[PDB]
Amino acid sequence: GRDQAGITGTWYNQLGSTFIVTAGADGALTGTYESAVGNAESRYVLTGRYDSAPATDGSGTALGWTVAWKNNYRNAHSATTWSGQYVGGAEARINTQWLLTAGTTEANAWASTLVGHDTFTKV
Amino acid sequence: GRDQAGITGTWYNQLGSTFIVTAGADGALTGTYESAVGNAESRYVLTGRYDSAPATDGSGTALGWTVAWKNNYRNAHSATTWSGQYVGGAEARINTQWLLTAGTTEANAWASTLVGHDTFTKV
Amino acid sequence: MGRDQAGITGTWYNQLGSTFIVTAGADGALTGTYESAVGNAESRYVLTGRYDSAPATDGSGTALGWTVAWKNNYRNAHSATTWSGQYVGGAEARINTQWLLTAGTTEANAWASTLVGHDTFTKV
Amino acid sequence: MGRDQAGITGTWYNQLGSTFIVTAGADGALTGTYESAVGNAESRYVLTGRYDSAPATDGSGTALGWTVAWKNNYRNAHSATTWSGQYVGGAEARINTQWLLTAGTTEANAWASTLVGHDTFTKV
Numbered sequence: 001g002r003d004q005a006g007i008t009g010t011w012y013n014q015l016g017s018t019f020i021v022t023a024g025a026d027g028a029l030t031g032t033y034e035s036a037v038g039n040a041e042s043r044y045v046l047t048g049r050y051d052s053a054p055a056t057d058g059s060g061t062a063l064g065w066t067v068a069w070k071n072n073y074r075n076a077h078s079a080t081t082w083s084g085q086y087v088g089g090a091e092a093r094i095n096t097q098w099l100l101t102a103g104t105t106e107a108n109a110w111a112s113t114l115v116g117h118d119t120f121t122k123v
Numbered sequence: 124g125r126d127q128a129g130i131t132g133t134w135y136n137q138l139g140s141t142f143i144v145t146a147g148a149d150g151a152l153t154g155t156y157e158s159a160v161g162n163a164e165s166r167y168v169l170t171g172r173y174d175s176a177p178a179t180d181g182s183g184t185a186l187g188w189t190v191a192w193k194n195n196y197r198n199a200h201s202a203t204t205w206s207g208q209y210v211g212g213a214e215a216r217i218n219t220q221w222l223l224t225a226g227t228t229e230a231n232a233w234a235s236t237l238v239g240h241d242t243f244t245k246v
Numbered sequence: 247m248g249r250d251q252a253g254i255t256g257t258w259y260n261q262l263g264s265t266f267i268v269t270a271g272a273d274g275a276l277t278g279t280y281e282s283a284v285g286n287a288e289s290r291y292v293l294t295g296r297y298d299s300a301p302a303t304d305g306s307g308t309a310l311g312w313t314v315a316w317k318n319n320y321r322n323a324h325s326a327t328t329w330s331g332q333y334v335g336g337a338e339a340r341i342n343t344q345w346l347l348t349a350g351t352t353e354a355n356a357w358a359s360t361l362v363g364h365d366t367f368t369k370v
Numbered sequence: 371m372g373r374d375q376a377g378i379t380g381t382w383y384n385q386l387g388s389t390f391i392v393t394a395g396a397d398g399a400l401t402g403t404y405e406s407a408v409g410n411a412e413s414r415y416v417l418t419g420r421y422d423s424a425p426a427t428d429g430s431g432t433a434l435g436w437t438v439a440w441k442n443n444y445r446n447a448h449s450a451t452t453w454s455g456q457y458v459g460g461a462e463a464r465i466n467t468q469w470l471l472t473a474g475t476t477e478a479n480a481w482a483s484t485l486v487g488h489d490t491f492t493k494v
């Protein structure tokens with residue numbers, strides 16, 4: 001994978017959450033997420049996908065991943081997906097937007113989903 | 124997994140796309156996605172997560188998954204994430220919202236990400 | 247004068263049973279009231295927005311958006327929704343939207359400030 | 371009369387270099403112009419929106435939103451953006467927003483009609 005080495009490792013966002021990911025040659029993302037906010041504690045499984053053969057025109061590398069907020073400690077009956085791109089260079093970044101959906105009744109489904117944006121850096 | 128059987132299988136959305144997924148007892152989602160629209164053809168790997176122990180109060184089951192739009196045929200330098208919930212009963216549904224991010228230059232990153240919503244049914 | 251001024255103007259209903267009453271101006275203005283069937287809302291709220299008053303003539307819809315702040319003379323939910331979408335004319339006219347609802351929060355909770363969803367409005 | 375009428379009113383700039391000039395009314399109205407540094411845009415466009423004119427007094431921000439349709443006397447991009455966010459006062463005042471930009475599309479292409487993003491506005 002072109003950016004397999006760039007992506008693999010530990011990332012931190014502006015909330016102080018910690019994302020540890022392995023990128024596979026085949027496009028796979030696997031790892032763990034630890035949120036510094038919300039109904040969450042310790043690590044949660046994450047899985048996702050990335051473009052393992054990106055353009056070489058200066059564009060970023062598209063990726064996404066999911067966390068369902070159940071681990072051996074807690075269950076927040078919810079899942080977040082991050083969609084974004086990896087940008088390399090002196091100062092690498094993963095810029096994302098996310099969707100967090102909670103399980104709701106049918107009557108409350110209109111208010112099921114939060115949206116936001118996280119920027120991840122290596123330091 | 125509570126809804127392991129409900130989720131596993133073939134789903135279709137309002138665009139005529141086809142999602143085939145296996146839910147694992149541990150929360151895993153694995154399968155393939157085939158879009159009926161956009162810069163896509165044949166199947167793409169998908170991975171994601173679901174709440175394997177949801178509430179039993181009538182609420183839906185939170186889940187999400189990712190597709191990176193590279194397979195052995197095509198590469199659209201982009202990834203979609205779906206965030207949503209599974210709703211069981213007579214007429215089962217997965218109601219989602221999604222984020223599609225394309226790799227862009229830095230100058231064009233403001234226009235990197237589409238948002239939309241897909242509803243999946245079994246028929 | 248606005249191409250779809252007459253199409254847009256009027257009363258619309260969404261899948262939740264909410265009611266959207268809007269006047270489109272020749273200049274691109276949208277003005278009206280919204281009444282939500284759900285949430286911390288009662289009676290009508292002011293809305294204002296904008297639409298493309300000179301759209302393409304190629305089968306494309308007509309881009310528009312509007313905002314409601316959820317304060318009126320009855321209640322205040324310390325929040326605002328924006329709908330962004332397009333109007334699609336014809337037999338079965340529709341306004342297809344996605345929306346963002348932001349509540350006022352502390353700094354610490356701002357990650358959790360904004361709901362997203364989608365509403366489809368029809369005339370009947 | 372609006373609690374943050376004086377805080378909101380004025381000129382704001384985002385991380386792209388766009389310029390947002392807005393007057394907040396006592397009644398919850400927002401009126402002004404937007405000039406984008408990016409995209410199919412040139413010069414100023416009308417904006418209208420709403421804000422919570424009686425917010426909580428507990429550290430929470432002030433919910434607001436506005437719309438711009440991307441048609442003026444120079445150009446038409448057949449599209450509209452809505453910003454949904456909150457104003458946060460103090461030393462380093464900010465309006466933190468997420469936005470939806472919908473273009474007019476055919477029915478067949480409507481799945482690809484809407485961009486989403488986030489803008490942070492400051493006074494300097």
Ligand SMILES: O=C(CCCC[C@@H]1SC[C@@H]2NC(=O)N[C@@H]21)N[C@@H]1CC(=O)[C@H](c2cc(CS)cc(CS)c2)C1=O
Pocket residue numbers: 013015017034035036037038039040069076077078080098100102116118357358
């Ligand atoms: O809280 C959660 C799970 C944690 C989600 C953290 C997010 S992912 C996007 C962003 N990026 C990060 O690095 N961290 C945040 N779910 C839901 C959402 C929520 O508000 C909720 C919740 C419920 C209750 C009991 S009713 C209390 C609280 C406050 S702790 C949160 C959840 O139970």
Ligand SMILES: O=C(CCCC[C@@H]1SC[C@@H]2NC(=O)N[C@@H]21)N[C@@H]1CC(=O)[C@H](c2cc(CS)cc(CS)c2)C1=O
Pocket residue numbers: 136138140157158159160161162163192199200201203221223225239241481482
């Ligand atoms: O097209 C794609 C990949 C397919 C995405 C299909 C989406 S997932 C959310 C929704 N739900 C579904 O079941 N299907 C749709 N990427 C990007 C997006 C796009 O517009 C773009 C594209 C580029 C070009 C050449 S510049 C042409 C076209 C028209 S085919 C699309 C892509 O290349």
Ligand SMILES: O=C(CCCC[C@@H]1SC[C@@H]2NC(=O)N[C@@H]21)N[C@@H]1CC(=O)[C@H](c2cc(CS)cc(CS)c2)C1=O
Pocket residue numbers: 110111260262264281282283284285286287316323324325327345347349363365
């Ligand atoms: O509830 C509100 C205001 C109403 C918003 C209705 C939305 S506009 C997008 C969609 N489309 C429609 O036609 N109707 C819905 N704000 C916030 C949102 C919310 O969840 C919340 C809320 C607070 C409380 C007590 S703090 C209780 C409830 C349940 S009534 C909702 C708010 O107080």
Ligand SMILES: O=C(CCCC[C@@H]1SC[C@@H]2NC(=O)N[C@@H]21)N[C@@H]1CC(=O)[C@H](c2cc(CS)cc(CS)c2)C1=O
Pocket residue numbers: 233234384386388405406407408409410411440447448449451469471473487489
């Ligand atoms: O470009 C426009 C209008 C300008 C929108 C600027 C956005 S509002 C959210 C963000 N925040 C800001 O302060 N500025 C940006 N519409 C659409 C969007 C787009 O990609 C598109 C476009 C079309 C064409 C030819 S068809 C070329 C280009 C590149 S100039 C963009 C449009 O024609």
